[PDB]
Design a protein around this ligand. Sequence first.
Ligand SMILES: Cc1sc2nc(COc3ccc(F)cc3)cc(=O)n2c1[C@@H]1C[C@H]1CO
Ligand SMILES: *[C@@H]1O[C@H](CO)[C@@H](O)[C@H](O)[C@H]1NC(C)=O
Lengths: 50, 50, 43
Amino acid sequence: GMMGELLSGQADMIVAPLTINNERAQYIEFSKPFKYQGLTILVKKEIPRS
Amino acid sequence: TGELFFRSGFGIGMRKDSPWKQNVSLSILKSHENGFMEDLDKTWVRYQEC
Amino acid sequence: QRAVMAVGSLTINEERSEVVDFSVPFVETGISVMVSRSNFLEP
Ligand SMILES: Cc1sc2nc(COc3ccc(F)cc3)cc(=O)n2c1[C@@H]1C[C@H]1CO
Ligand SMILES: *[C@@H]1O[C@H](CO)[C@@H](O)[C@H](O)[C@H]1NC(C)=O
């Protein structure tokens, strides 16, 4: 994917939402985050009708 | 649904030999502290709420 | 060089960004305002 493309030299900088991980940092150094958000669960909202 | 779990943050990934680390981190911090990030969030995330 | 490594409640700012180097922060905090609270089916 994108990480392998960056490692192969096909890329020089990534400007996209990429979660910081230990495995990613072990090979690709990251910069200071601009915004921090976790992961939640998405479920479709239904309106009951009885 | 759900409050939060495994909270993390985004970032920008560069190769370890790239000399554009500090010059990008400083620019990101300047943009964050100059009010650009909140304006971008308002113009691209904050919209009508159901 | 009085202390190579410093751990504590060090606020991150632009001026310290180039003078010293710091790792990824573990807790997020910044500028906030604290103000004392002041004391029919319409919607
Ligand atoms: C834990 C916390 S607390 C935390 N707070 C933030 C808040 O935004 C910034 C933006 C610029 C900055 F210079 C410092 C913080 C981001 C973030 O990612 N985090 C994190 C994850 C681990 C760090 C990865 O960068
Ligand atoms: C980073 O910016 C400084 C001036 O602010 C400049 O002298 C330096 O060459 C820049 N870094 C790179 C890798 O060009």
